[PDB]
Amino acid sequence: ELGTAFFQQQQLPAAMADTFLEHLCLLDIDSEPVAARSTSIIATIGPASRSVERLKEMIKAGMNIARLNFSHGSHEYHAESIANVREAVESFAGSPLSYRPVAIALDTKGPGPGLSEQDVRDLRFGVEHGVDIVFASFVRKASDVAAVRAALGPEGHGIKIISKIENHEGVKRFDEILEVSDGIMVARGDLGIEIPAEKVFLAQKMMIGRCNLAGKPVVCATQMLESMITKPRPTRAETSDVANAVLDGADCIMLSGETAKGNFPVEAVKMQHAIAREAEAAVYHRQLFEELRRAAPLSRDPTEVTAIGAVEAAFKCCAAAIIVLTTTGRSAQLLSRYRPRAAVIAVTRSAQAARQVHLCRGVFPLLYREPPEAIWADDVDRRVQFGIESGKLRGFLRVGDLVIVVTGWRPGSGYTNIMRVLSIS
Amino acid sequence: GTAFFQQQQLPAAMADTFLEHLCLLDIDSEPVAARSTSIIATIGPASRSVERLKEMIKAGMNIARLNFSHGSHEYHAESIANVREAVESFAGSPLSYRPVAIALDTKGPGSGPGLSEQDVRDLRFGVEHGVDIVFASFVRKASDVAAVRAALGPEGHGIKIISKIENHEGVKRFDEILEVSDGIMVARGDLGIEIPAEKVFLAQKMMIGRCNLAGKPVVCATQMLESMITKPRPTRAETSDVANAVLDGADCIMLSGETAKGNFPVEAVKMQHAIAREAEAAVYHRQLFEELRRAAPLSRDPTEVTAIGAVEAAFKCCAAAIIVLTTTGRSAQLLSRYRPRAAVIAVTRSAQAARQVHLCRGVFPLLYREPPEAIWADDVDRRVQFGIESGKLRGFLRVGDLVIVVTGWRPGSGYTNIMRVLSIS
Amino acid sequence: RADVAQLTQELGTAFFQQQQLPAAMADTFLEHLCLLDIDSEPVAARSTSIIATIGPASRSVERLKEMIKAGMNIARLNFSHGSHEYHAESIANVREAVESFAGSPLSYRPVAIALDTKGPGSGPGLSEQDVRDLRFGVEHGVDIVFASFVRKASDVAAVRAALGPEGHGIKIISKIENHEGVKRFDEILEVSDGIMVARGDLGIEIPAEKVFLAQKMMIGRCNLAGKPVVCATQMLESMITKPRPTRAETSDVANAVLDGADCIMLSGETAKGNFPVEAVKMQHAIAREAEAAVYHRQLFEELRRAAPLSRDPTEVTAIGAVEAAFKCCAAAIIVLTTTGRSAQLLSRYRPRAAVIAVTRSAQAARQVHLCRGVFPLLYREPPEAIWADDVDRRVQFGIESGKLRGFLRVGDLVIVVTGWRPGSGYTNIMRVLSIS
Amino acid sequence: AFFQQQQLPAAMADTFLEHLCLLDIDSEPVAARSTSIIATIGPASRSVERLKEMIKAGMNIARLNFSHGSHEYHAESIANVREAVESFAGSPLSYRPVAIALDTKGPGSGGLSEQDVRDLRFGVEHGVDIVFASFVRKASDVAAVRAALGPEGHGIKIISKIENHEGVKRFDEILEVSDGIMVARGDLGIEIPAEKVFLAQKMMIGRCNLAGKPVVCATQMLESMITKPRPTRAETSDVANAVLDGADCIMLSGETAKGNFPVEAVKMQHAIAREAEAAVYHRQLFEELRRAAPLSRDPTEVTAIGAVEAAFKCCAAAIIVLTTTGRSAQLLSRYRPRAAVIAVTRSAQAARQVHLCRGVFPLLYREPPEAIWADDVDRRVQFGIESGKLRGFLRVGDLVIVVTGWRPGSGYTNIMRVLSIS
Numbered sequence A: 001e002l003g004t005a006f007f008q009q010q011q012l013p014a015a016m017a018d019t020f021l022e023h024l025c026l027l028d029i030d031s032e033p034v035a036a037r038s039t040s041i042i043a044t045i046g047p048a049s050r051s052v053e054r055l056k057e058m059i060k061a062g063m064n065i066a067r068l069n070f071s072h073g074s075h076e077y078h079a080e081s082i083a084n085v086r087e088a089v090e091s092f093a094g095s096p097l098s099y100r101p102v103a104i105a106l107d108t109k110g111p112g113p114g115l116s117e118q119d120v121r122d123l124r125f126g127v128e129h130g131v132d133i134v135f136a137s138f139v140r141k142a143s144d145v146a147a148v149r150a151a152l153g154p155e156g157h158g159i160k161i162i163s164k165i166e167n168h169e170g171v172k173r174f175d176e177i178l179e180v181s182d183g184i185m186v187a188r189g190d191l192g193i194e195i196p197a198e199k200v201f202l203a204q205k206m207m208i209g210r211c212n213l214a215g216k217p218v219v220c221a222t223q224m225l226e227s228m229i230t231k232p233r234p235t236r237a238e239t240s241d242v243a244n245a246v247l248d249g250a251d252c253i254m255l256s257g258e259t260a261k262g263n264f265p266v267e268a269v270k271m272q273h274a275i276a277r278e279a280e281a282a283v284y285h286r287q288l289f290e291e292l293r294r295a296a297p298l299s300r301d302p303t304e305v306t307a308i309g310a311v312e313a314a315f316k317c318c319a320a321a322i323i324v325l326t327t328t329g330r331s332a333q334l335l336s337r338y339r340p341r342a343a344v345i346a347v348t349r350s351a352q353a354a355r356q357v358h359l360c361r362g363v364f365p366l367l368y369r370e371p372p373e374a375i376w377a378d379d380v381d382r383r384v385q386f387g388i389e390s391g392k393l394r395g396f397l398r399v400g401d402l403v404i405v406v407t408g409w410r411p412g413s414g415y416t417n418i419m420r421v422l423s424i425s
Numbered sequence B: 001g002t003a004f005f006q007q008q009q010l011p012a013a014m015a016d017t018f019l020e021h022l023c024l025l026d027i028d029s030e031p032v033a034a035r036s037t038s039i040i041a042t043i044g045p046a047s048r049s050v051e052r053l054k055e056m057i058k059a060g061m062n063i064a065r066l067n068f069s070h071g072s073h074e075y076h077a078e079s080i081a082n083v084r085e086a087v088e089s090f091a092g093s094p095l096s097y098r099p100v101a102i103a104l105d106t107k108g109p110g111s112g113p114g115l116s117e118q119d120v121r122d123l124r125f126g127v128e129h130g131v132d133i134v135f136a137s138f139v140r141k142a143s144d145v146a147a148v149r150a151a152l153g154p155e156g157h158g159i160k161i162i163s164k165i166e167n168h169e170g171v172k173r174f175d176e177i178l179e180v181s182d183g184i185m186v187a188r189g190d191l192g193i194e195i196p197a198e199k200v201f202l203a204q205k206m207m208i209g210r211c212n213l214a215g216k217p218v219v220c221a222t223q224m225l226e227s228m229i230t231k232p233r234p235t236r237a238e239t240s241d242v243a244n245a246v247l248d249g250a251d252c253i254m255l256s257g258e259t260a261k262g263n264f265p266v267e268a269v270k271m272q273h274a275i276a277r278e279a280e281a282a283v284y285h286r287q288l289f290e291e292l293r294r295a296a297p298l299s300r301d302p303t304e305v306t307a308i309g310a311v312e313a314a315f316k317c318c319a320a321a322i323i324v325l326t327t328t329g330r331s332a333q334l335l336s337r338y339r340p341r342a343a344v345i346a347v348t349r350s351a352q353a354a355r356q357v358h359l360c361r362g363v364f365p366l367l368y369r370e371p372p373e374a375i376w377a378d379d380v381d382r383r384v385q386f387g388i389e390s391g392k393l394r395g396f397l398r399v400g401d402l403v404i405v406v407t408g409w410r411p412g413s414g415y416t417n418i419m420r421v422l423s424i425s
Numbered sequence C: 001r002a003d004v005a006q007l008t009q010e011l012g013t014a015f016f017q018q019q020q021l022p023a024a025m026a027d028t029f030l031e032h033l034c035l036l037d038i039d040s041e042p043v044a045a046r047s048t049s050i051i052a053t054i055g056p057a058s059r060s061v062e063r064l065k066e067m068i069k070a071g072m073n074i075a076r077l078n079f080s081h082g083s084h085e086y087h088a089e090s091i092a093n094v095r096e097a098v099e100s101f102a103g104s105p106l107s108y109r110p111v112a113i114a115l116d117t118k119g120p121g122s123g124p125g126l127s128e129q130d131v132r133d134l135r136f137g138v139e140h141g142v143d144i145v146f147a148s149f150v151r152k153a154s155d156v157a158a159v160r161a162a163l164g165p166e167g168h169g170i171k172i173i174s175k176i177e178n179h180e181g182v183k184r185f186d187e188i189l190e191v192s193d194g195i196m197v198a199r200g201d202l203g204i205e206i207p208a209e210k211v212f213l214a215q216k217m218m219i220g221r222c223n224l225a226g227k228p229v230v231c232a233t234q235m236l237e238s239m240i241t242k243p244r245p246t247r248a249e250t251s252d253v254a255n256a257v258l259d260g261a262d263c264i265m266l267s268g269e270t271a272k273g274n275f276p277v278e279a280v281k282m283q284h285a286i287a288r289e290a291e292a293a294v295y296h297r298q299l300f301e302e303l304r305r306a307a308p309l310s311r312d313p314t315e316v317t318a319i320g321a322v323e324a325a326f327k328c329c330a331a332a333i334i335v336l337t338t339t340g341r342s343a344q345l346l347s348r349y350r351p352r353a354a355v356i357a358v359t360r361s362a363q364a365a366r367q368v369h370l371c372r373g374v375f376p377l378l379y380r381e382p383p384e385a386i387w388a389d390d391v392d393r394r395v396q397f398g399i400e401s402g403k404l405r406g407f408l409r410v411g412d413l414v415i416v417v418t419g420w421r422p423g424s425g426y427t428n429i430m431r432v433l434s435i436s
Numbered sequence D: 001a002f003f004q005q006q007q008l009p010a011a012m013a014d015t016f017l018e019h020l021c022l023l024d025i026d027s028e029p030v031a032a033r034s035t036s037i038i039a040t041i042g043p044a045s046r047s048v049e050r051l052k053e054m055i056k057a058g059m060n061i062a063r064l065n066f067s068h069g070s071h072e073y074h075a076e077s078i079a080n081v082r083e084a085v086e087s088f089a090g091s092p093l094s095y096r097p098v099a100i101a102l103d104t105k106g107p108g109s110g111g112l113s114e115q116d117v118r119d120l121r122f123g124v125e126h127g128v129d130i131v132f133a134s135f136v137r138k139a140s141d142v143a144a145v146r147a148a149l150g151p152e153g154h155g156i157k158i159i160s161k162i163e164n165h166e167g168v169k170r171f172d173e174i175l176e177v178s179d180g181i182m183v184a185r186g187d188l189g190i191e192i193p194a195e196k197v198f199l200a201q202k203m204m205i206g207r208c209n210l211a212g213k214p215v216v217c218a219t220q221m222l223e224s225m226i227t228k229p230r231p232t233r234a235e236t237s238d239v240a241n242a243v244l245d246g247a248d249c250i251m252l253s254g255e256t257a258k259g260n261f262p263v264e265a266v267k268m269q270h271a272i273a274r275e276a277e278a279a280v281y282h283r284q285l286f287e288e289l290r291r292a293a294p295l296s297r298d299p300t301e302v303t304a305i306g307a308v309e310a311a312f313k314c315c316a317a318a319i320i321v322l323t324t325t326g327r328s329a330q331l332l333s334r335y336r337p338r339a340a341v342i343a344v345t346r347s348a349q350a351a352r353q354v355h356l357c358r359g360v361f362p363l364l365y366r367e368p369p370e371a372i373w374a375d376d377v378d379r380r381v382q383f384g385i386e387s388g389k390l391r392g393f394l395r396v397g398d399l400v401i402v403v404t405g406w407r408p409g410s411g412y413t414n415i416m417r418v419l420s421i422s
């Protein structure tokens, strides 16, 4: 029904193995990736990637999140970067085949015992300019996150807080930090200086695993393709690092000086895209999903229950995609936490949410703009078909394919409770 | 609550190993769940009175077996009439009415190589009188099943064929027999004579396991509580046998002499009910579900996909029940095959499907008698409410409990594709 | 199949069809059940020991000789019936029947003698009659005591005190027959040498439909502890009057073995039944089948995960030896034991290889029947001047009795477990040997 | 305090996800570094004084790249390495043997090139222990190298370098006839897409681990350390992941041969390896290796599993094995024990060659045989306990597993013994 050639692609013989050792032995270099690249790419916006024309090329190469490093440059400079990014993103708003929303992240300068005076001004700037994510520098304890949450005035409560663990104190207080944070960033640059360089990989692997268990996005950062600042190709250690960060379970991967000041910014985005696609295919979903399932506590939350039921169903039929109607992005995040092999096409009316779901691995946002139907059930079905139309368009779906549709019983966020098995018409 | 997690061997079912599970079995941990394993009671002079049968229904008789090896067609027609009169004596309360299937156990081929002439007449009688299940005696190969299917004719298309494996040939050709049969019966009486008595348990355990893997109902039969033919209580070996048949994975357990001619017909049914309730609580669902999940093949069938997703969701929230609408009973059978701990409350308008689902373990049928609503979605919701009301009335459900609702996208059999997480109001 | 492709070519495809070997190689328990073949015959010797109650139907020296041949390992004397004089004659008839095969020490089968106490009855502890019966057992050299109605750890202490200083070697198997005993099980097992699941009284004290949970829990806890457990009462009840048992009785016996019972017992089936030798033969047949169908893959891995880390050389050598035995499909594990402890420590890991235990102690040789898979050999030769030579002569005695009784054939691999110095407690050496 | 060190809370976890969550940066490694370090000998690491520092930093195998330099040049490198290694021979309980590996030029456009035959003959004449065969494509290429060593080069180990697509495809036939494999990522990253190299590395390492043969991870492991004193976050990650994958050896190419920091790179690889080995999830690893290993009727193979199982039960400090060829130690290594495999051998070539196996710590026994064989065996077991105690592997009170045979000569290993230290 699917074919012998289908079961050779995207490391399907390796993922069917009864053991992890057998899985490794079945990894085929001739087994090509079919699924879209799920791990998002954070690109640092600097002089080498600041023109509306250069930004248009980086969006095409695969940039999902645009990072503004507030350690360098004025508020006036970063406001122009925000405008150039928004102008480059809206240049494809006519065509829904090239239109992809891009999140804007503010990376704070850093602390001093707590939130610095400059950081309060920078955070206030981010709120006034509508940033989606905040990369809080040098988070040490839960009170540091609370300080950043407080500095995000009456307005900025929707902004996501990704705590950067860059020192020994934060590594030790990790559990309390993650509890109050929206996600974590393994800031390996400063971490490699505060703690022994040979212990950084344990912190990365521990934090990624704990984030995966918690269901919160984790970013792997610093020197991923460092040689790409001056060279067109990365070293064997750099491609290995990127691939292993994806394998560890990182939701996002990041380019710092490779995109901000490097001679090769578009090339680095293209390279990260290529390695991520390969690595995701080699993920051992059999053990991953069973462990995530066993480790996850029992839940009486319909969204959480529908999320595991949907991912279970998606694996059973090899669903092409899981279409989820979300408003805040929560439902899509809860699907992503179980690491499905099917792309989570998330249809939202919230432009902020559509940008913010790039933080979650495997979530492909669609901003649906249409005017609402008088009947709610009809409005839900127009958003579902919109999911299918775009899926068909961007290569995810073909007629005959199976998809899992996740919706709620009534309007408003938090009522997700339905999972539907749908055949593409 | 604390008290909830002490009942129905919940500490034992949470164990990381099967050895730990056994060590955590508490005799003071009472069963809460309803008895899922159905009870087949052989009809005889000890069980023909309408008043007596009413007591047997109350004790838990689900299937009434008519042994065609004894008695005339006239005799069995009076049996059918007494079973039906006794079952219909509780039709006045449709939320607490228990349907009872009627199974015809053929005389057999005897000396003959295939379907005997008497068997053709008996099968035609079964069809004319509306039997639900046929227990084909001495099935030796797949052609024997085909012969019985042919003898039922076009009017007996709906009747289920449970092949009785009673000899060595039938044990060897098991795979071909099970392939063409609706289910199997481990006929231990004749099997204990055809094969060495000390090898019968291996045939029982093999057949039960293979049936469980296939998703087809399996019946454990003969001498389960033999001493109760004359004595008020069974031996320590008999209670152990019944409990182990349930633990092995038998969908149904059966009483022959115990209910046909014995002095304790009602008490035998009460005893089997009691042991089954205890055994089901002690089932190690942690390993059972994970093995059944792993062993099941990939499917592109929406009913099959929704079934595994629903059972997975039911386990995540400790669902009180899974309410499924079904025409043929297939949807309920597909939920049953994954051995959920939640009761599969199956609502159906088909009286034959409601009787036949007793073959599947954990399926509690409800016959919906109301005439259809003009709007199909309203008619579906009225049947879901009928299920919640009967569930609440019979003690399956309490307000605050979570329930998984399984429905389809259009009327008619084959279209189940929706799973819904619902909280009892 | 790559993890058996080489050994299937060597040992053969016919070897890997017998004793439910395709079923035991399955990756899941569900797959194991699907691979159970009725045409797969048992090759190994019957490991689960058979306790037979000695009564009028099984008292003559000639009848006892037939029951030993049929497979009786332990002879139970029920002190709830009969006088001390009566039980002394039973002891004499059993000993006479056992010693009638002493002429061939490579094919002589030792039989343990167990005393089943009358019980406390109305009383709160050890009855006055029980004290007299226990002193009788000590005076007559019984190997095991089946303490009736044990309810707390103080009850077993009372029985150990009543045996006195002369009855220190006797094993105490506590019978759990009531709700109190089931609840205080952990404290009872801690101070007892083993347990007996007395299902007759247990089926009366607790609901009959709850007895199987108590049996399965107690057996599992005993298996975890490494102590012998006995399944008792109504196992083949219909054979008291009938030549063949019911489908429920064969099922019960097979399931008790599967649960992990070290011993199975015949009460009124042999004491007063019309077919006492037939019941022993039947229990032997069902046990051999059931042991083959044991899912050793998960059983051994669970027993290893559940067992705590040990710094005891005997305990360490025991797990290392059982692991080695499984790697090469060892025909047997030959262990030199004084008290039986080393053989008990091998048994707790439930090896598929037969634990052939060579001991000079006649009481230990009788008492190791309590452990499943231990086949005792009583070494009667006088010691060699060199200890290493004396050890090698006992190892050869084991290989010769193993070859003679069919356990071993030339080409088979065996695991030899010995110590570094004489005396009990010094087991620390494991040796892989090929049968010559 | 013992159960907090060397990631013991993480290794006790019931799941691999839980294992990752329990990784503690404050949990220090106690055990010795098992993964061997191959250092490429070049101009930056040629002096006897510089080599002595690299031996102290952790070098176990010295690689001679025959793609550059004359036979005269490589003979001087061999002499300088041997002089630096023998400078610590005065203390035989704390002397570290170093293997010498010859990395062939390759076939290039061509089977076995004419230069390769001359280079292989040179290695035989100079007593090399290992040969890193460049660009192996099929089983006949390995046979060609074995033929070129001749009758004098039987003892030399052949590590086939998989550097192209053909070699990756015919991997099963190559590994079957080779002594081990080297994942040559430099050329492999050019022949196949760079983003597919990690799949080849992970596949080859897993297949080698299954086979029980040594595997080497090679090229650009700490590349930035050629010009900088510290590596990038990607490079430390790469090294740690190669160890985690199951590589028996890790290699420094231009980082030791021509880099400004050759001793620093050896020190860095040692540090990352020690940390990574502690974070290995032995619970699942040993159970998977046990399940995956076929049944064997070979006493050495059987005693090897039995000994590793016993070592895990008592948390044995070390497994002392008496070996002649190194085979018994290799068979213990394949089950990846947490206990150090202290291997006592009289053969100097075997003692150098066991660096190819992860977790095998060679000891060269330099005393002449006792008249009684049992006494000679006990003296070698004591030599192992004394060197263990001396080098910090053992403390009084620790438990050790001793693996010996029933008679002298190779292939008769069949005994396992539980021993308590002093």
Ligand SMILES: O=S(=O)(c1ccc(CN(c2ccc(O)c(O)c2)S(=O)(=O)c2ccc(O)c(O)c2)cc1)c1ccc(O)c(O)c1
Pocket: B018, B019, B022, B209, B212, B244, B247, B248, B249, B282, B283, B284, B285, B287, B288, B289, B291, B292, C029, C030, C031, C033, C220, C258, C259, C260, C294, C295, C296, C298, C299, C302, C303
């Ligand atoms: O390998 S085992 O025999 C075993 C038995 C049962 C199960 C678990 N069931 C199970 C798991 C998956 C299935 O597909 C299935 O049909 C049954 S169970 O809990 O359902 C069960 C419980 C009780 C039984 O009598 C029985 O036969 C089975 C696993 C391993 C074993 C292993 C370890 C022990 O300590 C020990 O006493 C026995």
Ligand SMILES: O=P(O)(O)OC[C@H]1O[C@](O)(COP(=O)(O)O)[C@@H](O)[C@@H]1O
Pocket: A325, A326, A327, A328, A329, A330, A331, A332, A406, A407, A408, A409, A410, A411, A412, A413, A414, A415, A416
């Ligand atoms: O992921 P979220 O934010 O909780 O949103 C889930 C909600 O979105 C829906 O799927 C769509 O409903 P809306 O029409 O209100 O967007 C709801 O039925 C459900 O309550």
Ligand SMILES: O=P(O)(O)OC[C@H]1O[C@](O)(COP(=O)(O)O)[C@@H](O)[C@@H]1O
Pocket: B303, B325, B326, B327, B328, B329, B330, B331, B332, B406, B407, B408, B409, B410, B411, B412, B413, B414, B415, B416
């Ligand atoms: O299990 P079956 O036989 O497929 O019946 C399930 C069917 O019942 C329904 O749930 C309800 O349909 P009906 O209105 O015909 O009763 C269908 O949507 C579904 O196809």
Ligand SMILES: O=P(O)(O)OC[C@H]1O[C@](O)(COP(=O)(O)O)[C@@H](O)[C@@H]1O
Pocket: C336, C337, C338, C339, C340, C341, C342, C343, C417, C418, C419, C420, C421, C422, C423, C424, C425, C426, C427
């Ligand atoms: O099982 P036990 O009672 O500990 O006996 C094991 C003992 O038996 C031996 O193997 C042989 O002992 P003996 O020389 O005393 O007969 C000892 O080396 C070891 O200490």
Ligand SMILES: O=P(O)(O)OC[C@H]1O[C@](O)(COP(=O)(O)O)[C@@H](O)[C@@H]1O
Pocket: D300, D322, D323, D324, D325, D326, D327, D328, D329, D403, D404, D405, D406, D407, D408, D409, D410, D411, D412, D413
């Ligand atoms: O690892 P190898 O080469 O098989 O060597 C193992 C051999 O070493 C020993 O342990 C000691 O052997 P030697 O007396 O030859 O040194 C033997 O008993 C065994 O045969």
Ligand SMILES: O=C([O-])C(=O)[O-]
Pocket: A137, A164, A166, A186, A187, A188, A189, A190, A191, A221, A222
């Ligand atoms: O700021 C950062 O991201 C760092 O230091 O790694």
Ligand SMILES: O=C([O-])C(=O)[O-]
Pocket: B166, B186, B187, B188, B189, B190, B191, B221, B222, B256
């Ligand atoms: O007919 C039966 O039920 C049998 O043979 O078991």
Ligand SMILES: O=C([O-])C(=O)[O-]
Pocket: C175, C177, C197, C198, C199, C200, C201, C202, C232, C233
């Ligand atoms: O005494 C017994 O054996 C019993 O009660 O079962």
Ligand SMILES: O=C([O-])C(=O)[O-]
Pocket: D163, D183, D184, D185, D186, D187, D188, D218, D219
């Ligand atoms: O020769 C090598 O090692 C390479 O090319 O990687």
Ligand SMILES: [K+]
Pocket: A069, A070, A071, A107, A108, A109, A110, A137
């Ligand atoms: K910054």
Ligand SMILES: [K+]
Pocket: B067, B068, B069, B105, B106, B107, B108, B137
């Ligand atoms: K019949």
Ligand SMILES: [K+]
Pocket: C078, C079, C080, C116, C117, C118, C119, C148
């Ligand atoms: K008694």
Ligand SMILES: [K+]
Pocket: D065, D066, D067, D103, D104, D105, D106, D134
């Ligand atoms: K070269």
Ligand SMILES: [Mg+2]
Pocket: A137, A166, A187, A189, A190
């Ligand atoms: Mg920083």
Ligand SMILES: [Mg+2]
Pocket: B137, B166, B187, B189, B190
């Ligand atoms: Mg019959």
Ligand SMILES: [Mg+2]
Pocket: C148, C177, C198, C200, C201
């Ligand atoms: Mg009693």
